Design a protein around this ligand. Structure first.
Ligand SMILES: NC(=O)c1ccc[n+]([C@@H]2O[C@H](COP(=O)([O-])OP(=O)(O)OC[C@H]3O[C@@H](n4cnc5c(N)ncnc54)[C@H](OP(=O)(O)O)[C@@H]3O)[C@@H](O)[C@H]2O)c1
Ligand SMILES: NC(=O)c1ccc[n+]([C@@H]2O[C@H](COP(=O)([O-])OP(=O)(O)OC[C@H]3O[C@@H](n4cnc5c(N)ncnc54)[C@H](OP(=O)(O)O)[C@@H]3O)[C@@H](O)[C@H]2O)c1
Lengths: 326, 122, 326, 122
């Protein structure tokens, strides 16, 4: 019901829906279309935009920054986030070492033409770097005014808790958010492992791929449409998933969900996105969109949210047959 | 092997999480039950309770079951603490026995309204 | 008797009277008049000037900074303070999150054309932001040289103590002052709750609206004068208070106080302001003034202060009938 | 539930402020009386006193009235501490009694200058 919410228990307020830039910005869509998606999103109250040094080899950040600069939006009305881990071919250009966090964030900031991001994320865990080093580097970039906060992405709850305890031990800053994959076909981490962290140390979840890259939209009920992400050069892996035996099973379950959507008077994408927001532990869902129609439809997920009663949720669980055991 | 810090009225205790997970039905062994006492600012669980008793409570987990009352702690205060930490009826019974207390029975009347009446005044 | 005093127990020395800029600067009065008030104040030893990002949508800071720059006063001879909380229409432009404290203070500094303020204040408490985050942000702006000290405004003593303990816990900087409303008709907080904090942790009070926006001046004994704050567009709420049943009762009590004023040989505004300074816990009183006459009269409150004997104070208490129970 | 740290000659104790406010007439329960011992640099009240005794003093507040002298602490040192923390005459009496001390009376003469004189040598 509340459009805006705290990111975890931090004081940072984000819209429950954000717009990501993976695959699209500087890649699948034109800069004109990217400017159009961002404008539409911003005019509709969405204040959260997520990107990463790895998207399109840095061009996603360049396009995102070009739009923010061209539109003149007040920096204080935006929450920009970026992720660091894979920043180049050289050995020292990847990972969460102090060298790569500082250099990677500095180069993203340059591509974004911004003095800082609101949240910097470790795009994934790093077995080769001591937690202390990572936590001190993140704390460093925040004290240098290069970021306001930091978070983790694809880390286990054990690793997130280690960062938090290392932070308390050395008087550093703990992470405030974990960026986890979450949709009807990937529920374990967000529903079973993250809640304890939310209540115990205030870490919130900012989930991605709420439509499992388009799979949950229903658009793949009769094969791979032209110009769909599954048909892009470089995304054969996605095509393989859809046509696989498991892919077929998913599509069949989606036909069952459509009836739920009609009962709630909404489209499947709207239902799928609202479902991700039914529990408090999720602070925001990062959407993906290759055109304006998709974005305008997906934003409507907010009207569905109040209708997800325990009854409806139990039903979706029955259909999916994959509710994780607590 | 994640560590846990339990602060008993200022006296600091530390142990491994796997040492507490050994007894899941107790307060400390159950995440949901101890959640209430967690201080996220200091990364410790705080209990505003009796100090001399906790040693033995923690040793119970480290020893794998040994619950000995400290010589300097009154039996009534200790037993209240065993109850608070929810160590369970088995440990409690083992404790009382070793402490010199074993009683149990009582055969009432068959509930005859007659037998139970006569038996009570005889 | 001592014109200057320590702000709480900090080493910052302020005049017992300061000049505020709410309603007036960039709003009710001309920049020419604002330059005139500031000059008069500075030439009379007043070194404290208070403003806020919210006053006149930022114009109060612009006018204050224009004067300081034009007069060429040595920055080291001034104590400039500003308040942060409401800095815009966007969701992320209000509150005490790290994002808004840094961005809000940075934008005020730009409007003030100053490298830093002497004291930055949280204009009010923020339920939606962890104390730790706020205290780390304030400590951050001080370490960045953006402020010399920080304080609270409209916080309860419980919240002020929480900031102090959070500061000790993480080796951060505690607040040194609370900006509380204080006048003959609003005494609770300053007389009952703040003293303990003054003696225990050194936090001092810097009170505002010592004339309850003009109500205590006596100027409203026969209705709402033209050009008075109560008659300004946007201040109907003040007009409502004056004419209300409670307002009438206040005005009647003011007639009783006038006799006290004459016995002490001063005007009611002078008595009201000096009364605010009778107890050590108050470091300074922030005055408001829409013209030079008012300021020259109000400054005379300093001559009254030595005459407030226990006898006179007991009398004022009898008349007001609102002395709070300790 | 604000916490309070009491440092007894280096030994650190912590409790909730509502635990101390339970007994307003004692030193620790009265803001004005304990103010003198507050260290604003460390956010703690410091007492340059006997260590083994404080446990029991703090437990008195946590227990809601139980004042047991620790086995390892001499009765004369403990009683001085009960007096220092101003626990009051009731707690003190309860303490002495439980400690095995109950005496009270003395009927003097009516102050007859005569009776009181005869009674004293008989
Ligand atoms: N933390 C991490 O490691 C991580 C990893 C991956 C992504 N992310 C973040 O999460 C964001 C969102 O992820 P995502 O792009 O995978 O999200 P998604 O919501 O699962 O998929 C969005 C894509 O599905 C299609 N789509 C969306 N709405 C539709 C509609 N109404 N009808 C039909 N098709 C629709 C579009 O693809 P087509 O139109 O091309 O078919 C669109 O590009 C990213 O941009 C990024 O910011 C983070
Ligand atoms: N911390 C916070 O949240 C907070 C909140 C509010 C204010 N403040 C600070 O406190 C400062 C002072 O507050 P304030 O303006 O309400 O103060 P005040 O002293 O209660 O009222 C000043 C106003 O009363 C009138 N006045 C003053 N002296 C007079 C005199 N001798 N004769 C007749 N009328 C006289 C003037 O209004 P007219 O001439 O227009 O009638 C003047 O603008 C502010 O400027 C601000 O810096 C802080």
């Amino acid at each position: 019901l509340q459009f805006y919410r705290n990111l975890g228990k931090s004081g940072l307020r984000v819209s429950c829906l954000g717009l990501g830039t993976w695959v699209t910005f500087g890649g699948q869509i034109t800069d004109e279309m990217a400017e159009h998606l961002m404008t539409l999103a911003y005019d509709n109250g969405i204040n959260l935009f997520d990107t990463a040094e790895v998207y399109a080899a840095g061009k996603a950040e360049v396009v995102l920054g070009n739009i923010i600069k061209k539109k003149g939006w007040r920096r204080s009305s935006l929450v920009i986030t970026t992720k660091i881990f894979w920043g180049g071919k050289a050995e020292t250009e990847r990972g969460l070492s102090r060298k790569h966090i500082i250099e990677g964030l500095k180069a993203s900031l340059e591509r974004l033409q911004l003095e800082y991001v609101d949240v910097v994320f470790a795009n994934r865990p790093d077995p080769n770097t001591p937690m202390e080093e990572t936590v001190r580097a993140m704390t460093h970039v925040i004290n240098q005014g290069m970021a306001m906060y930091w978070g983790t992405s694809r880390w286990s709850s054990m690793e997130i808790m280690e960062a938090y305890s290392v932070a308390r031990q050395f008087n550093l800053i703990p992470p405030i958010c974990e960026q986890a994959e979450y949709h009807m076909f990937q529920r374990e981490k967000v529903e079973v492992q993250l809640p304890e962290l939310f209540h115990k140390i205030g870490v919130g979840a900012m989930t991605w791929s709420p439509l499992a890259c388009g799979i949950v939209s229903g658009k793949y009920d009769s094969g791979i449409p032209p110009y769909s992400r599954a048909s892009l050069k470089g995304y054969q892996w996605l095509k393989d998933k859809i046509l696989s035996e498991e892919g077929r099973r998913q599509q069949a379950k989606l036909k069952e969900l459509q009836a739920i959507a009609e009962r709630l008077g909404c489209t499947l994408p709207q239902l799928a996105i609202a479902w991700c927001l039914r529990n408090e532990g999720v602070s925001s869902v990062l959407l993906g969109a290759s055109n304006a129609e998709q974005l305008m439809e997906n934003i409507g997920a907010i009207q569905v949210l109040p209708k997800l009663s325990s009854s409806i949720v139990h039903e979706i669980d029955s259909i999916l047959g994959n509710k994780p055991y607590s | 092997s994640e560590r846990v810090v339990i602060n008993i009225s200022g006296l600091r205790f530390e142990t491994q999480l796997k040492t507490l997970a050994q007894f899941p039905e107790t307060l400390l062994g159950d995440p949901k039950k101890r959640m209430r006492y967690f201080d996220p600012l200091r990364n410790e669980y705080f209990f505003d309770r009796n100090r001399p008793s906790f040693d033995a409570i923690l040793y119970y987990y480290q020893s794998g079951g040994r619950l000995r009352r400290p010589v300097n702690v009154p039996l009534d205060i200790f037993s209240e603490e065993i109850r608070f930490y929810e160590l369970g009826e088995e440990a409690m019974e083992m404790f009382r026995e070793d402490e010199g207390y074993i009683k149990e029975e009582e055969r009432p009347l068959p509930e005859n309204e007659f037998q139970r009446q006569v038996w009570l005044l005889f």
